Scaffold this active site. Structure first.
Site, mmCIF file in Angstrom:
data_model
loop_
_atom_site.group_PDB
_atom_site.id
_atom_site.type_symbol
_atom_site.label_atom_id
_atom_site.label_comp_id
_atom_site.label_asym_id
_atom_site.label_seq_id
_atom_site.Cartn_x
_atom_site.Cartn_y
_atom_site.Cartn_z
ATOM 1 N N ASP A 131 -32.399 4.221 -12.747
ATOM 2 C CA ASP A 131 -31.727 3.970 -14.060
ATOM 3 C C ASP A 131 -32.703 4.006 -15.244
ATOM 4 O OD1 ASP A 131 -29.328 3.517 -15.532
ATOM 5 O OD2 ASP A 131 -29.450 1.304 -15.246
ATOM 6 N N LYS A 133 -33.982 4.741 -18.479
ATOM 7 C CA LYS A 133 -33.446 5.225 -19.736
ATOM 8 C C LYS A 133 -34.059 4.313 -20.784
ATOM 9 C CE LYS A 133 -29.146 2.439 -18.974
ATOM 10 N NZ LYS A 133 -27.677 2.409 -19.260
ATOM 11 N N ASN A 136 -33.161 0.597 -21.080
ATOM 12 C CA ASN A 136 -33.642 -0.418 -20.087
ATOM 13 C C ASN A 136 -35.124 -0.843 -20.300
ATOM 14 O OD1 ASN A 136 -31.080 -0.654 -18.886
ATOM 15 N ND2 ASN A 136 -31.589 0.607 -17.098
#
Ligand SMILES: CC(C)NC[C@@H](C(=O)N1CCN(c2ncnc3c2[C@H](C)C[C@H]3O)CC1)c1ccc(Cl)cc1
Length: 330
Positions: A131, A133, A136
């Site tokens: 995840d 990105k 984050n």
């Protein structure tokens, strides 16, 4: 034994799809944390149960200077509560928004910290993050990276083992994920490529508001760079954003070591990265332990309340979850 009553609820820091994060003070100790609060009902209804338990597991099992540290997890009849360190520097987007582009030196500094964290997850935890990105990535009060949100992690992934779940945010998906024919841990290096690109270039490497068109670009379109970008940065980013994971920097058996030895990182001492011996190029200018200047006023202005003998209730809409009984050992 910790409950909701043990904390003073100070400011809304943000709201995501499945819940909210509040700046809290633990009353007994005077310490400040970010409490992520999820409604059991919402998690169940949106099928987010498995991700929530993964996030819980991965936070309990990991200790790294650049991963957000979990202090407590606990549950009520209707809520799941993660009490984590407060990342006073806010989301990297807040900064990157405002400044448009980070310098290559500042991107390098953040990139090294992210590589350090991902190397630990891959090498030491057999975890693939999946995840990566901009959303984050946060900054702690010292200006060091914190990766946050572990719901899409994959555990038990050793070496070249493959995964098949299609997941991640559309703009950030690696070509082999969009191919949907299995993928491996090099999807994280694709993500490192995308975030370092955003940092240095000021925009996504590939964008269309139509997803089908976005996905075509990700799969087929050769990477381009603003022509001010230095050669080493361009070399690093082109290597991270190879479409074929077997040709991608970090895509072979050496994993992160291939990225660590790229000439963009020349002169970086990786043990010093790990030990936080590199001075951050930006220090958050917070003036108190409750200063929320690096958070969106849209959130911080909002009022907080207790909602927006039941100890043993275990229902279908509100399950009694396993492993929500956690207090990090002092
Ligand atoms: C751009 C926007 C959609 N971003 C949504 C995002 C958000 O607003 N955030 C700001 C507040 N927030 C945090 N804020 C401060 N410190 C921390 C966090 C993480 C929980 C880790 C911890 O060190 C979490 C990220 C979010 C993510 C999950 C939840 Cl449950 C709520 C909010």
């Amino acid at each position: 034994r910790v409950t909701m009553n043990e904390f003073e609820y100070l400011k809304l820091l943000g709201k995501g799809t499945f819940g909210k994060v509040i700046l809290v003070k633990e009353k007994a100790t005077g310490r400040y944390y970010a409490m992520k609060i999820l409604k059991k009902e919402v998690i169940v209804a949106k099928d987010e149960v498995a991700h929530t338990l993964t996030e819980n597991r991965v936070l309990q099992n990991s200790r790294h200077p650049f991963l957000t540290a979990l202090k407590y997890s606990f549950q009520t009849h209707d809520r799941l509560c993660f009490v984590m360190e407060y990342a006073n520097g806010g989301e990297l987007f807040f900064h990157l928004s405002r400044e448009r582009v980070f310098s290559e030196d500042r991107a390098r500094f953040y990139g090294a910290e992210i590589v350090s964290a991902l190397d630990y997850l891959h090498s030491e935890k057999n975890v693939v993050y999946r995840d990566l990105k901009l959303e984050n990535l946060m900054l702690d009060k010292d200006g060091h990276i914190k990766i946050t949100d572990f719901g899409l992690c994959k555990e038990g992934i050793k070496d070249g083992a493959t995964m098949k779940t299609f997941c991640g945010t559309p703009e950030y998906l690696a070509p082999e994920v969009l191919e949907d024919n299995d993928y491996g841990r090099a999807v994280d290096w694709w993500g490192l490529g995308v975030v370092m690109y955003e940092m240095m270039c000021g925009r996504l490497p590939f964008y269309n508001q139509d997803h089908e068109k976005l996905f075509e670009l990700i799969l087929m379109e050769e990477i381009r760079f603003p022509r001010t970008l230095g050669p080493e940065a361009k070399s690093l980013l082109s290597g991270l954003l190879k479409k074929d994971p077997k040709q991608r920097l970090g895509g072979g058996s050496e994993d992160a070591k291939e990225i660590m030895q790229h000439r963009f990182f020349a002169g970086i001492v990786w043990q010093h990265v790990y030990e936080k011996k590199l001075s951050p190029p930006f220090k958050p200018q917070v003036t108190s332990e409750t200063d929320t200047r690096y958070f969106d006023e849209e959130f911080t202005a909002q009022m907080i309340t207790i909602t927006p003998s039941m100890e043993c209730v275990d229902s279908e809409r509100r399950p009694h979850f396993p492993q929500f009984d956690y207090s990090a050992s002092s």
